[PDB]
Design an enzyme around this catalytic site. Structure first.
Site, mmCIF file in Angstrom:
data_model
loop_
_atom_site.group_PDB
_atom_site.id
_atom_site.type_symbol
_atom_site.label_atom_id
_atom_site.label_comp_id
_atom_site.label_asym_id
_atom_site.label_seq_id
_atom_site.Cartn_x
_atom_site.Cartn_y
_atom_site.Cartn_z
ATOM 1 N N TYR A 109 -13.518 -1.146 13.922
ATOM 2 C CA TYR A 109 -12.132 -0.941 13.515
ATOM 3 C C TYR A 109 -11.323 -0.335 14.659
ATOM 4 C CZ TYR A 109 -8.122 1.124 11.050
ATOM 5 O OH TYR A 109 -6.857 1.502 10.693
ATOM 6 N N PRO A 132 0.396 6.990 12.507
ATOM 7 C CA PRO A 132 0.507 8.018 11.463
ATOM 8 C C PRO A 132 -0.800 8.779 11.316
ATOM 9 C CG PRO A 132 0.258 5.862 10.478
ATOM 10 C CD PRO A 132 0.314 5.627 11.961
ATOM 11 N N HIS A 178 -9.050 9.300 -0.068
ATOM 12 C CA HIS A 178 -8.862 10.346 0.928
ATOM 13 C C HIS A 178 -8.906 11.724 0.269
ATOM 14 C CE1 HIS A 178 -8.120 7.311 3.834
ATOM 15 N NE2 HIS A 178 -6.821 7.162 3.657
ATOM 16 N N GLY A 189 0.792 -1.210 0.000
ATOM 17 C CA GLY A 189 0.000 0.000 0.000
ATOM 18 C C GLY A 189 0.832 1.272 0.000
ATOM 19 N N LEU A 190 0.158 2.366 0.331
ATOM 20 C CA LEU A 190 0.786 3.679 0.393
ATOM 21 C C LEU A 190 1.997 3.680 1.323
ATOM 22 C CD1 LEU A 190 0.831 6.730 0.039
ATOM 23 C CD2 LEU A 190 -0.874 6.851 1.858
HETATM 24 N N1 LIG Z 1 -3.019 6.139 5.365
HETATM 25 C C1 LIG Z 1 -3.316 6.790 6.551
HETATM 26 O O1 LIG Z 1 -3.535 8.004 6.533
HETATM 27 C C2 LIG Z 1 -3.400 6.004 7.749
HETATM 28 C C3 LIG Z 1 -4.009 6.655 8.929
HETATM 29 C C4 LIG Z 1 -4.012 5.789 10.105
HETATM 30 C C5 LIG Z 1 -3.559 4.534 10.070
HETATM 31 N N2 LIG Z 1 -3.043 3.943 8.914
HETATM 32 C C6 LIG Z 1 -2.631 2.506 9.007
HETATM 33 O O2 LIG Z 1 -1.460 2.238 8.246
HETATM 34 C C7 LIG Z 1 -1.540 0.874 7.799
HETATM 35 C C8 LIG Z 1 -1.532 0.818 6.278
HETATM 36 O O3 LIG Z 1 -1.348 2.087 5.800
HETATM 37 P P1 LIG Z 1 -1.948 2.112 4.125
HETATM 38 O O4 LIG Z 1 -2.684 3.434 4.148
HETATM 39 O O5 LIG Z 1 -0.673 1.896 3.408
HETATM 40 O O6 LIG Z 1 -2.926 0.833 3.971
HETATM 41 P P2 LIG Z 1 -3.214 0.416 2.361
HETATM 42 O O7 LIG Z 1 -2.595 1.448 1.459
HETATM 43 O O8 LIG Z 1 -4.696 0.231 2.390
HETATM 44 O O9 LIG Z 1 -2.496 -1.073 2.065
HETATM 45 C C9 LIG Z 1 -2.861 -1.904 3.158
HETATM 46 C C10 LIG Z 1 -2.150 -3.269 3.080
HETATM 47 O O10 LIG Z 1 -2.843 -4.240 3.896
HETATM 48 C C11 LIG Z 1 -2.813 -5.480 3.164
HETATM 49 N N3 LIG Z 1 -3.932 -6.281 3.673
HETATM 50 C C12 LIG Z 1 -5.229 -5.824 3.978
HETATM 51 N N4 LIG Z 1 -6.034 -6.792 4.456
HETATM 52 C C13 LIG Z 1 -5.220 -7.955 4.470
HETATM 53 C C14 LIG Z 1 -5.492 -9.290 4.864
HETATM 54 N N5 LIG Z 1 -6.781 -9.638 5.352
HETATM 55 N N6 LIG Z 1 -4.518 -10.266 4.782
HETATM 56 C C15 LIG Z 1 -3.293 -9.820 4.299
HETATM 57 N N7 LIG Z 1 -2.889 -8.600 3.897
HETATM 58 C C16 LIG Z 1 -3.896 -7.659 3.990
HETATM 59 C C17 LIG Z 1 -2.935 -5.085 1.622
HETATM 60 O O11 LIG Z 1 -2.486 -6.067 0.831
HETATM 61 P P3 LIG Z 1 -3.272 -6.004 -0.843
HETATM 62 O O12 LIG Z 1 -2.429 -4.919 -1.434
HETATM 63 O O13 LIG Z 1 -3.082 -7.417 -1.404
HETATM 64 O O14 LIG Z 1 -4.642 -5.631 -0.374
HETATM 65 C C18 LIG Z 1 -2.048 -3.807 1.591
HETATM 66 O O15 LIG Z 1 -0.734 -4.203 1.266
HETATM 67 C C19 LIG Z 1 -2.926 0.273 8.306
HETATM 68 O O16 LIG Z 1 -2.759 -0.455 9.529
HETATM 69 C C20 LIG Z 1 -3.741 1.534 8.478
HETATM 70 O O17 LIG Z 1 -4.710 1.406 9.449
HETATM 71 C C21 LIG Z 1 -2.947 4.699 7.747
#
Ligand SMILES: NC(=O)c1ccc[n+]([C@@H]2O[C@H](COP(=O)([O-])OP(=O)(O)OC[C@H]3O[C@@H](n4cnc5c(N)ncnc54)[C@H](OP(=O)(O)O)[C@@H]3O)[C@@H](O)[C@H]2O)c1
Ligand SMILES: NC(=O)c1ccc[n+]([C@@H]2O[C@H](COP(=O)([O-])OP(=O)(O)OC[C@H]3O[C@@H](n4cnc5c(N)ncnc54)[C@H](OP(=O)(O)O)[C@@H]3O)[C@@H](O)[C@H]2O)c1
Lengths: 323, 334
Positions: free
Chosen positions: A140, A172, A188, A23-24
């Site tokens: 969540y 974050p 977003h 992901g991001l």
């Molecule tokens: N972005 C923000 O502003 C923000 C704010 C607060 C917290 N976070 C936290 O930061 C973390 C991720 O950041 P992100 O924004 O990069 O998330 P993302 O862009 O949505 O990518 C999330 C990752 O989780 C993997 N994933 C999801 N469900 C899964 C499952 N059931 N089994 C295995 N792999 C799984 C996905 O794999 P696929 O690619 O195969 O789906 C992807 O690589 C999360 O814990 C999120 O809560 C982010």
């Protein structure tokens, strides 16, 4: 103390497992690791690699890659029941595998939206469990709350058994950058505005922003978040979560975000605000005091510079970008 | 949602076609329900599960009684309250064992269309910073005490999971209600009377029994002056059964006695002393430090919803438990 006397030094024999690595946030971590020549074998898992909610499937990457460090970023973000079960099962599995397989340090990821609904700003890490989260995403939120608690509980067990397993977490706030989700409807605020502006530039239309443009948010470039997360891995020994965000003085308003996006696309047309849409909450400020005190010399990417890089990535990769 | 009152207009009437599944039906609370069901000849096929019937922490094992018995009602009393061995008692286990068992049971309740499911919380999971008397609405208003916080959070997430399954049932048009009760300190037959691992009151009973047989002094830890609310398990079973019959709210309802009925720890010890007819000394070991003086929970909701409910007097309930203990000591949990 909160930081080790000397930083952990990675070697070629270390293996770092990064769940949710595609992901991001994961892509930024991979970008910084390659750019800064961080040592070790880094394994960026995605869902294609295995369903981490199933306990047996979850140990397979641990048996296969034998990690020494884990960065746990995966989450499920539909019935509230599913958000509770999917997240609490995955988190229970991953942390349990981390303890059983002798992972040296595990860093998990919390979120700004799991803090108490009744809370006095600025949000500080110490307020995580001081009341119920907002009703709207409380499944969540509680699963994230219990991800933090399960880490503290595994620290107690490690202390008791003399095992060298450390669990901590980062929080974050509003990440943006390359490999984001740029869908105007589902994505977003910041990545969606990028796509709306670009469509307004390709077409003859006006750049339309939903709302007055006045609410202020703190926005963290994903590349910066990756540097802060890596520093945490190398140096940060406390089991308390550490907030990753920019200072309050660096909060931009939505109108500032939209204006910065326009001037990074070199957009020449008009930009209008549709005030029919109700304005969100005015301020939801997170404190970076802890990171500021522990790593005082940290340098952020200026917001304008970060928008130019994301727009540039978004332009070079529009065909392959998530939209 | 404004439509339903806290109670049905008329109590549910069980028929012979109803199947009532009781997880944890072999422990203290469960055996009390089994006693009331038999004493009052309640209709339905009642199944009192124990761990010998299957480990409810395992998802596949949990399905087996639901596929077999297809219940219309579920009373969920099973919980992991401690293992006999140290290695099973890390906080990790109290979280995992309980949250797995709770997730499995409520999920089975929903998938198999149970009409009403009543799960069990505890007054020791409420926030540590709190104003006395404890009321049900304060359950999530802050972190629980540190010493049992894994068990406490698992109970909190059992309450939340029920609310979330009610949301799913409403959206799917299923007729599934999830609610819970919060009993206070329970005592009675089929308790755990191990002095080391058991609750204070059953431990005092086993201690008094040893003192009578051995010739020793009956020793109570602490000064004896802390005040506690104690609920006879047979009374709790009737309150629980009333809840299944009448109570429609998803908010937990406390099962406890009034503040006037709180006994001091010494008062409990004396009642135990006089029910064994123990004639030796009763001594307070003040070298041990005792807990806080008052920890009052409110019974206002049950008192308002069921004003004519009759409790068993404390002395009569203690004598009934002691008589059970003397007649069954060999098979009693110790
Ligand atoms: N972005 C923000 O502003 C923000 C704010 C607060 C917290 N976070 C936290 O930061 C973390 C991720 O950041 P992100 O924004 O990069 O998330 P993302 O862009 O949505 O990518 C999330 C990752 O989780 C993997 N994933 C999801 N469900 C899964 C499952 N059931 N089994 C295995 N792999 C799984 C996905 O794999 P696929 O690619 O195969 O789906 C992807 O690589 C999360 O814990 C999120 O809560 C982010
Ligand atoms: N007793 C109190 O003072 C008190 C106060 C507040 C709340 N409560 C609540 O009341 C409920 C029961 O209390 P209790 O006092 O009856 O506990 P108990 O006397 O210790 O019996 C507990 C029950 O849970 C069953 N059980 C435990 N682990 C199991 C597993 N893995 N699979 C299947 N069954 C399992 C036991 O089965 P076996 O008999 O086969 O081991 C027993 O039937 C719990 O939810 C507890 O929180 C009790």
């Amino acid at each position: 103390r909160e930081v080790s006397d000397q930083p952990i030094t990675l070697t070629q024999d270390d293996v770092i497992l990064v769940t949710g690595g595609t992901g991001l946030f994961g892509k930024a971590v991979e970008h910084i690791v390659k750019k800064e020549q961080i040592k070790g074998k880094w394994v960026f898992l995605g869902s294609k690699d295995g369903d981490l909610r199933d306990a047996d499937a979850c140990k397979q990457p641990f048996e296969k890659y034998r990690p020494t460090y884990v960065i746990h970023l995966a989450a499920f973000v539909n019935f509230k029941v599913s958000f509770w079960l999917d997240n609490v099962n995955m988190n229970n599995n991953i942390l349990t595998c981390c303890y059983d397989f002798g992972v040296k340090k595990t860093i998990s990821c919390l979120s700004t939206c799991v803090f108490p609904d009744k809370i006095e700003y600025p949000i500080t890490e110490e307020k995580l469990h001081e009341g119920p989260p907002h009703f709207s995403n409380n499944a969540y939120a509680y699963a994230k709350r219990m991800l933090d608690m399960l880490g503290r509980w595994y620290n107690e067990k490690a202390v008791n058994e003399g095992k060298s397993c450390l669990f901590t977490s980062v929080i974050p706030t509003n990440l943006f950058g390359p490999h984001d989700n740029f869908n105007v409807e589902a994505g977003h605020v910041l990545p969606g505005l990028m796509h709306k502006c670009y469509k307004a530039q390709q077409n003859g239309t006006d750049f339309v922003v939903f709302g007055s443009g006045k609410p202020l948010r703190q926005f963290l470039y994903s590349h910066d978040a990756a540097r802060m997360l890596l520093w945490t891995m190398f140096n940060y020994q406390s089991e308390e979560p550490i907030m990753l965000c920019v200072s309050e003085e660096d909060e931009k308003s939505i109108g500032q975000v939209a204006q910065t996006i326009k001037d990074a696309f070199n957009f020449t047309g008009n930009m209008v605000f549709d005030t029919s849409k109700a304005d969100g909450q005015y301020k939801k400020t997170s404190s970076n005091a802890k990171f500021l005190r522990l790593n005082p010399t940290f340098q952020y990417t200026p917001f304008e510079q970060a928008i130019k890089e994301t727009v540039q990535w978004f332009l070079e990769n529009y065909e392959t970008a998530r939209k």
